[PDB]
């Protein structure tokens, strides 16, 4: 249709206004004295929340240009939460800060490209300074402490996570489920997890987590792309009876076929969910087989001349539970016989021997690790269905936090790590004055999180920021107790990874917007 | 319906405004310091791009006259990218420049026709001057260098392309595909390529490339025009089962029949794609047969009395992969027996002997070259499905760039070739003063690309243009390093063919607009 095209300054102010609505709405929740945001609902009572992510999801502006601005930072900010399980709100306020000043510099006539180079240089410097500040979290003692802090001081959760990582390694698969009632349970079962999310939402039957959860599902492994959902009918009808859900793992499920699956499972007849087969090329055909052996299923490939129409329930794999993400699939408790599974592991281990390459070797180790490693299942304690669901949530978060802390350590939270790191880059310079301004723009922005947290407390940002900058190390301002001291000792910290991702992702979208000269959108008509 | 008719000056200003929106939106992306353009989407997050072609595609104006302006240059500019795989943006800014000044001259009372003759004369001169400036790219060493530069300094890609051209000649068919995993692969298989595109989009299942891609497809060769899609049913049903895609190569597939194919393949039942048979007249019937022999299929012609209803899967040809373009079809790895294919080649080679003409001889050689030459298949390396798809893209582009460089060489990029070529035509004159103005209009426009690139860098066009013009040869301004020197040595170049096509296509639409006196469009009512 006819488009409305805006340029330079007009385009920029629109974007600025858009992110201001977004950031302003979200940042009120930041910190221990964060404020409530009321989100309306089509039917029922409004939602009262302090969850920056929830607020962000609801933001959509009437002005198309302003909206594009909001959707952009809204998008990369979420990339942060995906990468470290936290930091979107931080990323969002950081983006507003960089963009606001960056745009001012532009209107003052400074070079957008040099401004961006400066911001980027400052960010790189900052991330290194961040690694330096970082404290390791490698032993179970630390793993437990972090988990406890994440679970809101629940030593139980900390203990659980530490035991779970001790069982499958700190890089092993760990899932959480509702318990059988009072008292937690930790079990390691035959399972696996690969990087492939659902082939479309709608499959999502747990919107709170935006995940797909199937119980006692059959698993169809098809080494091909599915176009005509007719091929499926005979098998789907079989799965229809038996009343069990079905997970389709194919090379791909195309539009119409996928549509059919969504519609039909939504009508109650047959519960299905599909995801692409892991990897590509030859390591794909191999992995597809691993899953088969693990779940006691039979891969259906056209090469050998097999047909889907002739596939019976007996060809299908089986597991007690599968969980699908926006980009992850994890199979829990596969039926596959230990004899076959363990034997399969043996075959892959010889492959590693006959391996005439390091790459080919690393890929084979990855496979056995999955097949041999299993999956740690944490079953959250209980005493009332309500408390049980609430604890399960804290555990899930504590888990993501601990996982990140194990990967890159921790740093002083409450936004002091960022302000501390910036205080050290006071002499960082670029190739020209514009680049220097860019550097100052970024360093100044790194104070946004702390300042906002302080503002929410009803205190004076300038003063607290001034004091925190005056000291060093992990000396900061505890917004909760409203007292200064060592942030780590006071147990107020963030995984170095979450702070890093928040900053890099913010700096990214900010850099893009500052270097935007034209915007195109449909006419409001 | 009732039309709105505009004349002379009114019509002209409308067109000018239209192309100004187009060019202004697109040119911000030009050069290494190009800016981002944000393109909105009906659902999701906006698209942030520096791809002038993507921006151009989204441009549609509300004012019908202004829109016609944009659509016209938008159209011929795209012809450039089609001819050399690059240059649309350049062509677009070149068109804005010629049109802007050209229209000024018109309003000043100068003769439109003479102005156009002058522009054209200057362009012809410039293209010759461009050939002179051109550096050959005939040996594999050069072929590799160019490909490496195109692949963004990836010697691997350069090497691959050079090896591929060494296998099938620099005028031979070369295709790229996803690899089997890590490490590239180069293979020559039985294949062919002719000048016939898809009989309609929709068939396109790879919008990124605007191409149709079928895997392990059957191939129906019918020496007739298809009207009643009923004739097909028996065969389509056969192809329906077997679950394989079908390529229809007929004299033509008419509206309704074509409509049916699109609809049904879009519903998952049977994947089809159709294209016209290559060539015309008698050399058509022959070529149709070559494809048959190459793919092991049987041509179905009415002359011999064959019917489509009685055609079985066994009559259909077969190949591992076919790729259809906006105007090209390439068959990869045909099943045809080497005995039959090689024997067929023999028959054509005797034809060349018994040839009592040079034309008839050239045509026969073309056929054997196709049938005997085969097709070089580059399978892009890997290590993660993402990197693999990204490298495959760089290879595909590097390929187009190298192909063009092999045809007409290379010249100093960064827009300096054009400004250099113009600096030499300072004495070019026409038959009258209007024509002289036309010449100066074109020569002045040839500076648009460089000037725009410099402006995006935040520098002063007048000065850089002034300096580049002051020197000679391939002495230019490296916008990346923002330093002067030899453009070729610094590895900043464009295939002579892309610069030539951009200029000629720009000059074409500009000449047409300058000589437009009346515009007719539907009433906004």
């Amino acid at each position: 249709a006819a488009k409305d095209v805006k340029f330079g300054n007009d385009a920029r102010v629109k974007m600025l206004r858009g992110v201001n609505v977004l950031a302003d709405a979200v940042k009120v929740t930041l910190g221990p004295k964060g404020r409530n945001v009321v989100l309306d609902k089509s039917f029922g009572a409004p939602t009262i929340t302090k969850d920056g992510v929830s607020v962000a999801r609801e933001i959509e502006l009437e002005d198309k240009f302003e909206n594009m601005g909001a959707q952009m930072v809204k998008e990369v900010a979420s990339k942060a939460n995906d990468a470290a399980g936290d930091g979107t709100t931080t990323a969002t306020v950081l983006a507003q800060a960089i963009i606001t000043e960056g745009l001012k510099a532009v209107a003052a006539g400074m070079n957008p490209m040099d401004l961006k180079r400066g911001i980027d240089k400052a960010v790189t410097a900052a991330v290194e300074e961040l690694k330096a500040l970082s404290v390791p979290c490698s032993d179970s003692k630390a793993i437990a402490q972090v988990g406890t802090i994440s679970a809101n001081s629940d030593e139980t959760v900390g203990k659980l996570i530490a035991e779970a990582m001790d069982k499958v390694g700190k890089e092993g698969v760990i899932t959480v489920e509702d318990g059988t009632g009072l008292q937690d349970e930790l079990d390691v079962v035959e399972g696996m997890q690969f990087d492939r999310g659902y082939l479309s939402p709608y499959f999502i039957n747990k919107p709170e987590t935006g995940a797909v959860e199937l119980e006692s599902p059959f698993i169809l492994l098809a080494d091909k792309k599915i176009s005509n959902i007719r091929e499926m009918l005979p098998v789907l009808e079989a799965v229809a009876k038996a009343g069990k859900p079905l997970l389709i793992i194919a090379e791909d499920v195309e539009g119409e076929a996928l549509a059919t699956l969504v519609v039909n499972t939504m009508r109650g007849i047959v519960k299905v969910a599909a995801v692409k087969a892991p990897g590509f090329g030859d390591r794909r055909k191999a992995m597809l087989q691993d899953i088969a052996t693990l779940t006691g299923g039979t891969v259906i490939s056209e090469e050998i001349g097999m047909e889907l129409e002739k596939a019976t329930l007996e060809d299908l794999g089986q597991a007690k539970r599968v969980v699908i993400n926006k980009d992850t699939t994890t199979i829990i408790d596969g039926v596959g016989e230990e004899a076959a599974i363990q034997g399969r592991v043996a075959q892959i281990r010889q492959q590693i021997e006959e391996a005439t390459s390091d790459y080919d070797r690393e890929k084979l180790q990855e496979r056995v690790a999955k097949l041999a490693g299993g999956v740690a299942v944490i079953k959250v304690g209980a005493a009332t269905e309500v408390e049980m669901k609430e604890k399960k949530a804290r555990v899930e978060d504590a888990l993501h936090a601990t996982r990140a802390a194990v990967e890159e350590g921790v740093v002083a939270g409450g936004g002091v790590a960022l302000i501390r790191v910036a205080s050290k880059l006071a002499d960082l310079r670029g190739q020209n004055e514009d680049q220097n301004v860019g550097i100052k723009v970024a360093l100044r922005a790194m104070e946004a999180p702390l300042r906002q947290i302080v503002l929410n407390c009803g205190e004076e940002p300038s003063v607290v920021a001034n004091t925190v900058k005056g000291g060093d190390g992990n000396y900061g301002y505890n917004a909760a107790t409203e007292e200064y001291g060592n942030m780590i000792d006071m147990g107020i910290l963030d995984p170095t990874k979450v702070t890093r991702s928040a900053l890099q992702y913010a700096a990214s979208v900010a850099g893009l917007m500052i270097t935007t000269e034209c915007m195109v959108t449909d006419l409001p008509k | 319906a009732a039309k709105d008719v505009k004349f002379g000056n009114d019509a002209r200003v409308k067109m000018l405004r239209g192309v100004n929106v187009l060019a202004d939106a697109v040119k911000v992306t030009l050069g290494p310091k190009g800016r981002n353009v944000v393109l909105d989407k009906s659902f999701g997050a906006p698209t942030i791009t520096k791809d002038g072609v993507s921006v151009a595609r989204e441009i549609e104006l509300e004012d019908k006259f202004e829109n016609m302006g944009a659509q016209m240059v938008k159209e011929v500019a795209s012809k450039a990218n089609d001819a050399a795989g690059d240059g649309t943006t350049t062509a677009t800014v070149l068109a804005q420049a010629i049109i802007t000044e050209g229209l000024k001259a018109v309003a000043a009372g100068m003769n439109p026709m003479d102005l156009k003759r002058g522009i054209d004369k200057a362009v012809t001169a410039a293209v010759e001057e461009l050939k002179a400036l051109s550096v050959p790219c005939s040996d594999s060493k050069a072929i590799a260098q160019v490909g490496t530069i195109s692949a963004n300094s990836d010697e691997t890609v350069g090497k691959l392309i050079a090896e591929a051209m060494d296998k099938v000649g620099k005028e031979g068919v070369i295709t790229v595909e996803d690899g089997t995993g890590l490490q590239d692969e180069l293979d020559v298989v039985e294949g062919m390529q002719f000048d016939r595109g898809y009989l309609s989009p929709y068939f396109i299942n790879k919008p990124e490339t605007g191409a149709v891609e079928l895997e392990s497809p059957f191939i129906l060769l019918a020496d007739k025009k298809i009207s009643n899609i009923r004739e097909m049913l028996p065969v389509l049903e056969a192809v329906a089962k077997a679950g394989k895609p079908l390529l229809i190569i007929a004299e033509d597939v008419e509206g309704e029949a074509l409509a049916t194919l699109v609809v049904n393949t879009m519903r998952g039942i049977v994947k089809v794609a159709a294209v016209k048979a290559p060539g015309f007249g008698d050399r058509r019937k022959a070529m149709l047969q070559d494809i048959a022999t190459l793919t092991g299929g049987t041509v179905i012609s009415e002359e011999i009395g064959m019917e489509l209803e009685k055609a079985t899967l066994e009559d259909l040809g077969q190949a591992k992969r076919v790729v259809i373009n906006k105007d090209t079809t390439t068959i990869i790895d045909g099943v045809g027996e080497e005995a039959a294919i090689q024997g067929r080649v023999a028959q054509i080679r005797q034809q060349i002997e018994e040839a009592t003409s040079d034309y008839d001889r050239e045509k026969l050689q073309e056929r054997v070259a196709k049938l005997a030459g085969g097709v070089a298949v580059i399978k892009v390396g890997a290590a993660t499905e993402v990197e693999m798809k990204e490298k495959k893209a760089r290879v595909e582009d590097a390929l187009h760039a190298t192909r063009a460089a092999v045809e007409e060489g290379v010249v100093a990029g960064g827009g300096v070739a054009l400004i250099r070529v113009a600096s030499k035509l300072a004495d070019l004159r026409g038959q009258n003063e209007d024509q002289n103005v036309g010449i100066k209009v074109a020569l002045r426009a040839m500076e648009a690309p460089l000037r725009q690139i410099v402006l995006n860098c935040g520098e002063e066009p007048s000065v850089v243009a002034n300096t580049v013009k002051g020197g000679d040869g391939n002495y230019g301004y490296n916008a990346a390093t923002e330093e002067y020197g030899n453009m070729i040595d610094m590895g900043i170049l464009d295939p002579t063919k892309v610069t030539r096509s951009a200029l000629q296509y720009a000059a074409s639409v500009a000449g047409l607009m300058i000589t437009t006196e009346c515009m007719v469009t539907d009433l906004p009512k």
């Binding site: 959902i229 007719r230 009918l233 789907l236 009808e237 229809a240 009876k241 119409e256 059919t260 519609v263 039909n264 009508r267 007849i269 047959v270 | 519903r267 998952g268 039942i269």
Partner: peptide, 12 residues
């Protein structure tokens, strides 16, 4: 446009 199997599956 679509059809329904005896068991209720809606499909093209």
């Amino acid at each position: 446009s679509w059809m329904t199997t005896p068991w209720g599956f809606l499909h093209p």
